[PDB]
Design a protein around this ligand. Structure first.
Ligand code: NA
Ligand code: NA
Lengths: 203, 202
């Protein structure tokens, strides 16, 4: 596997390029080379938006998944529609745990009370240009309690809940109808683990 | 009829591009990549339209990604290099990744994927098949990455690794491979490798 550590990097500076809702910084740095010595000075524009907790709501009794739908305008230029089917998710504030945030966002974004959880994976969304990390859990839910329109009018959020079979959700990944990283990763994980997960949660 | 709506089995998204009006896009920053402000209004689930909304969107183009798989040997090729943006949330910013590159003006996913396999990993690719195409993080960036699996014989400052498929997937499970493109590609491979090995060794 890997070889080097943070001691093998010199971050010379992080220079603010843009500050608004999100931020962009120019990282200026040097790093050790595989064949020895230090690199020249490298610069990269890095999009900074904090980090997220993500929850796949799975009903192991019914073999159903709860998805949320809302507009993500950034999807527009490359997608059939900017309304996407997604996992519940939210930012992790200072000092918070993934599990606390995941449970809260499930309740706030989709009205869901989560029972047990298990970790899926924690991933870097696109580390060539953004620092964002997202940590995914699967959360036990009763999919008869998933309903209604959600979102804070204070943040111009408008969210619909969809309850589908696991099989349908995964088929939608295969077909490209679900095609955002968090949901693809979560639903592929679920396809690899659902048998044992249902056993664990219906014992 | 609106009072006898009877499409029970129909599931999926609710609205189309005709249900949103993009009023303007204003560039907030443009260096190499850019940040645009999209100003728009959109239909609401309970009826009507929102007022004008603005969102900041990180614009960095789109990528082609290639999972290099040797179906004869059941091996995967990984490329290792520093990704400084990983620094704040990772023990090391050197990541194990799939080959990938930007799709430039007028280019196709397959051409870019094959080119990057040669330039980034020194690999000549045989057959390719699509894996999946995904939005990296659509709440803040437009970036789409389109993954192919490419048939290889496994025999920037980059180190090329050749590992068993089993080892690569174990590294996903353990968190040693933890970037979206590689996680998605290797999960896909775990779900499809029996069929892919049969298809490519026939
Ligand atoms: Na949320
Ligand atoms: Na590349």
């Amino acid at each position: 596997g890997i070889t080097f550590s943070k001691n093998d990097v010199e971050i010379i500076a992080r220079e603010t390029l843009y500050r608004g809702f999100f931020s962009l910084d120019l990282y200026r740095f040097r790093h050790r080379l595989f064949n020895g010595g230090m690199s020249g000075e490298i610069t990269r524009e890095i999009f900074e938006r904090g980090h997220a907790a993500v929850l796949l709501p799975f009903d192991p009794v019914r073999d159903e998944v709860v998805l949320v739908e809302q507009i993500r305008i950034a999807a527009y230029d490359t997608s059939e529609s900017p309304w996407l089917l997604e996992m519940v998710a939210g930012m992790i504030e200072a000092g918070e745990t993934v599990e606390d945030v995941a449970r809260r966002e499930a309740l706030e974004e989709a009205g869901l009370e989560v029972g047990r959880t298990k970790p899926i994976l924690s991933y870097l969304a696109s580390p060539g240009g953004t620092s964002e990390r997202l940590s995914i859990l699967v959360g036990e839910v009763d999919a008869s309690t998933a309903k209604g329109i959600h979102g804070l009018a204070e943040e111009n959020e408008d969210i619909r809940v969809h309850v589908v079979s696991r099989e349908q959700a995964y088929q939608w990944v295969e077909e490209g109808k679900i095609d955002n990283a968090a949901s693809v990763i979560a639903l592929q994980w679920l396809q690899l683990h659902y048998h044992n997960l249902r056993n664990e949660w219906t014992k």
